[PDB]
Amino acid sequence: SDLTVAVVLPLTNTSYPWSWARVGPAVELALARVKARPDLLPGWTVRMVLGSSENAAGVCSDTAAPLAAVDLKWEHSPAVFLGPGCVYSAAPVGRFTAHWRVPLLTAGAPALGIGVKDEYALTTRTGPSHVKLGDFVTALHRRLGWEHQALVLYADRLGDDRPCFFIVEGLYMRVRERLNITVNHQEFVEGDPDHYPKLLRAVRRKGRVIYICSSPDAFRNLMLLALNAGLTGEDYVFFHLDVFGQSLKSAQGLVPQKPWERGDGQDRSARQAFQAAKIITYKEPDNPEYLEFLKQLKLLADKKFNFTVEDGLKNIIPASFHDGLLLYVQAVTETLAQGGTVTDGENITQRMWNRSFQGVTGYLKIDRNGDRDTDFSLWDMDPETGAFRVVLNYNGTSQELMAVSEHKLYWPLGYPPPDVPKCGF
Ligand SMILES: *[C@@H]1O[C@H](CO)[C@@H](O[C@@H]2O[C@H](CO)[C@@H](O)[C@H](O)[C@H]2NC(C)=O)[C@H](O)[C@H]1NC(C)=O
Ligand SMILES: *[C@@H]1O[C@H](CO)[C@@H](O)[C@H](O)[C@H]1NC(C)=O
Ligand SMILES: [Br-]
């Protein structure tokens, strides 16, 4: 019989990490692996029905998505939902699926609010979530002895899925819960020169350990301004929250990363400014199955989905959809083996939560709350070359920070700055 999967993702817009053009080829690869394992889903064939989260304007919507989920639910009685990826689409869809007691799988929806599983029942997140970044910051602060204060600056585009707002919301709640520190925050608009005076005033008076969520250019600009104001690596550290690594190039091999470089006549000043800057990204999976996945994903997307998949950290999302689907397929199989059936959402979800699995993204742990443990990398500058590289990795499960390639964290004075200045703010 059929195990029907309902997909609510962006079907025509190709610009999201969870767009169908990237997730669809990944899902196909997953279903081919399943089809070649007869021990899986004994007497059940996975079929896919598709609905779009996009409004007329072509963006993922808080309206189009639940309307589509409702339609797919009536027409197909799906055993499970795949997606949505956008916070704004996921929020209403997840409340519906919870009410239907039908499992929803996603590698998007990183927002804090989705982690409230009393509301978002049977939602399993197999991609990153923003509280996990709070875990990473928590670890950093314990490693480096920062136990009092931090400042967060963040900005977003005109009005959308507000990635940076949700990143900060996630970071703030988790960090406050575990470290009891004071976390000042401050929103700004990127294209507005009126906002810079207040940003630089806030850096001066509100913190010394500083987190910035913004476009690569807004970060560079702020660093240049910080330098000109005599705010240097001795008293300050600036973390760029750039989870998908936009400020950095991919498939570089031995070509050194110089995120401070523009050829705009400020490169020397930028390099000098970036001595005080470190970059926080998701961890690039390093296992060989992943590189094979990327090879296969690229070929399939170009062939059947009319789309060129670029190298980048964004590709972890479709791979996590891939892995999530397989984790779900294993769970259903285990449920069938012990007398259950495919529509037993609660029993299927219990078998995914608090569990380890091996997939193209490597080792993956889903925590007790149904959210994947997320790994992070910290990049900083070789003072000799100006180049950036990964110097620390964070394992989301063990909560361990490990040195990478025997590198040392760069500090101008050889030790990190205190989070409170010796004379007060
Ligand atoms: C695909 O999605 C992107 C958004 O993720 C669309 O681009 C935004 O479009 C709105 C108007 O709808 C603008 O105000 C934003 O500033 C745009 N932002 C970005 C990031 O470009 C894009 O138009 C969509 N494309 C299609 C064909 O539907
Ligand atoms: C992360 O730590 C966990 C828990 O010890 C371990 O299972 C896993 O193998 C680690 N991840 C990697 C990629 O080493
Ligand atoms: Br979506």
Swiss-Prot record:
Disulfide bonds join 60-86, 164-213. Phosphorylation of the protein kinase-like domain is required for full activation by ANP. Chloride binds at residues 53, 85-86. It is found in: Membrane. Glycans are attached at residues 13, 180, 306, 347, 354, 395. It comes from the Eukaryota. Receptor for the atrial natriuretic peptide NPPA/ANP and the brain natriuretic peptide NPPB/BNP which are potent vasoactive hormones playing a key role in cardiovascular homeostasis. Plays an essential role in the regulation of endothelial cell senescence and vascular aging. Upon activation by ANP or BNP, stimulates the production of cyclic guanosine monophosphate (cGMP) that promotes vascular tone and volume homeostasis by activation of protein kinase cGMP-dependent 1/PRKG1 and subsequently PRKAA1, thereby controlling blood pressure and maintaining cardiovascular homeostasis. Belongs to the adenylyl cyclase class-4/guanylyl cyclase family. Homodimer. This is Atrial natriuretic peptide receptor 1. The gene is Npr1. The chain holds residues 29 to 453 of 1057 of the full protein.
